[PDB]
Design a protein around this ligand. Sequence first.
Ligand SMILES: O=C1C[C@@H](c2ccc(O)cc2)Oc2cc(O)cc(O)c21
Length: 208
Amino acid sequence: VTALEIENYAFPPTVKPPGSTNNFFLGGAGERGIQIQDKFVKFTAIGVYLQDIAVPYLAEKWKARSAHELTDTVPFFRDIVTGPFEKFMRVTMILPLTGHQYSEKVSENCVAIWKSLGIYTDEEAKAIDKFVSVFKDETFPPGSSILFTVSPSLTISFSKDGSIPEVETAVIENKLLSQAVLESMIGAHGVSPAAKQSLASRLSKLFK
Ligand SMILES: O=C1C[C@@H](c2ccc(O)cc2)Oc2cc(O)cc(O)c21
């Protein structure tokens, strides 16, 4: 596939997440913004990479549907989130964020929606606690990146720019946390509609 450039940040077509050794391709990328006082403040640029094997898996079930169709289909993105393949997310900050600011916002989203499905055990709370522990002292100037590998486990890595380090920072062995992080971005209530549309556009075409 092709590379994508989002808000002056470049996402190449392939990456090598640090922990894994599988091949990944850029499924899509998009900005993430919030609405404050009449203005859409763009905070991050998100790149969603998928393991190569995701194309045959998704091609079987989502072939013959237009990009417009896939964007609305909620089960299409749930398959991207939960499929039996690795996912890698790059979150590059457009505006500066502290790790506490980032993890707290990640935290409530993940905890509340887990209460939606009545799957919130005391284990996920421990996963959340570790997640917050990873981010506690981190700071993320413009251009720095938060890297997530979602594996059938969540691997967390940090970079001061857009490059991928050779060694992660932490691994959290929880399947729901690893999935929630990605759901919070490209899910039904996903904070990056633009990443969803990029994913819809690029994967449907790949299915051809
Ligand atoms: O990429 C971001 C930005 C982050 C954020 C924005 C502004 C702010 O003040 C604090 C955090 O919120 C998020 C929350 C998520 O669940 C997943 C995400 O990818 C993100």
